[PDB]
Design a protein around this ligand. Structure first.
Ligand SMILES: [Cl-]
Ligand SMILES: [Zn+2]
Length: 258
């Protein structure tokens, strides 16, 4: 594909191939904590990953995915702002060229070192490819990463990155429990938005956790040793694969908490 994160094919350019890039419900956005409306009618999230079944980890070129077997009918996100049940299909991250940036969502303009996205599709549409064509097709759980103590549950992900350094490489990645990536609290903000990479489809109910996870400097630095390029090509370190905040327009961010 033409799009990427370079000066000439990066987010400022995506609209040429994907005109919805300038649409009405684009992601990510800045979350203004003063104006986000507390809604005490928002239910607790239900995150059930006990039966989530990881399969593989793959370098897609702009980031890496940890892919799950989404036939596992109890591996599910529901509750919160959602109707019905959503199946976990993959997770991935966005990160920066340094610790002071890398997140896609921002909180009062604050950028985190990275952001984790756990992607789920609405079972009422049969599969992921059908779900992305509907406004309520996906639910993405977003979790900020900040630098400090190490996150033990991330270690297996960061240690495997060496073996999938370049575009196209994959590795077995079974027995990975995504519960190890969740913070203590599930308090969240939610708003209707989009995929943050092309095709940028406006099919996503965003659920962004207020509480970041701490990861160590060494852990996040392993993200930056990945490469955009394929094997043999000239080294281009994979960094700054985040889309900046987009106009909120006529949307309301709600908060499940104070
Ligand atoms: Cl490490
Ligand atoms: Zn993402």
């Amino acid at each position: 594909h033409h799009w990427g994160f370079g000066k000439h094919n990066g987010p400022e350019h995506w609209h040429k191939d994907f005109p919805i890039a300038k649409g009405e419900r684009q992601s990510p956005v800045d979350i203004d904590t003063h104006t986000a409306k507390y809604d005490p009618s928002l239910k607790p999230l239900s995150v059930s990953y006990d039966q989530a079944t990881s399969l593989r980890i793959l370098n897609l070129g702009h980031a890496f995915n940890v892919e799950f077997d989404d036939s596992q009918d109890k591996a599910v996100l529901k509750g919160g702002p959602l109707d019905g049940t959503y199946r976990l299909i993959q997770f991935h991250f966005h990160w920066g060229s340094h610790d002071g940036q890398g997140s896609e969502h921002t909180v009062d303009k604050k950028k985190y070192a990275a952001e984790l996205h756990l992607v789920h599709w609405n079972t009422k549409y049969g599969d992921f490819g059908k779900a992305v064509q509907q406004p309520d097709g996906l639910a993405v759980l977003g979790i900020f990463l900040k630098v400090g103590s190490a996150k033990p549950g991330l270690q297996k992900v960061v240690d495997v990155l060496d073996s999938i350094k370049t575009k196209g490489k994959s590795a077995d990645f079974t027995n990975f429990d995504p519960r190890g990536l969740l913070p203590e609290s599930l308090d969240y903000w939610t708003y209707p938005g989009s995929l943050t990479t092309p095709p940028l489809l406006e099919c996503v109910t965003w659920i962004v956790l207020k509480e970041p996870i701490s990861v160590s400097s060494e852990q996040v630095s392993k993200f930056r040793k990945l490469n955009f390029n394929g094997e043999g090509e000239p080294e281009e370190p994979m960094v700054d694969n985040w889309r900046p905040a987009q106009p909120l327009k006529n949307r309301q961010i709600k908060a499940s908490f104070k």
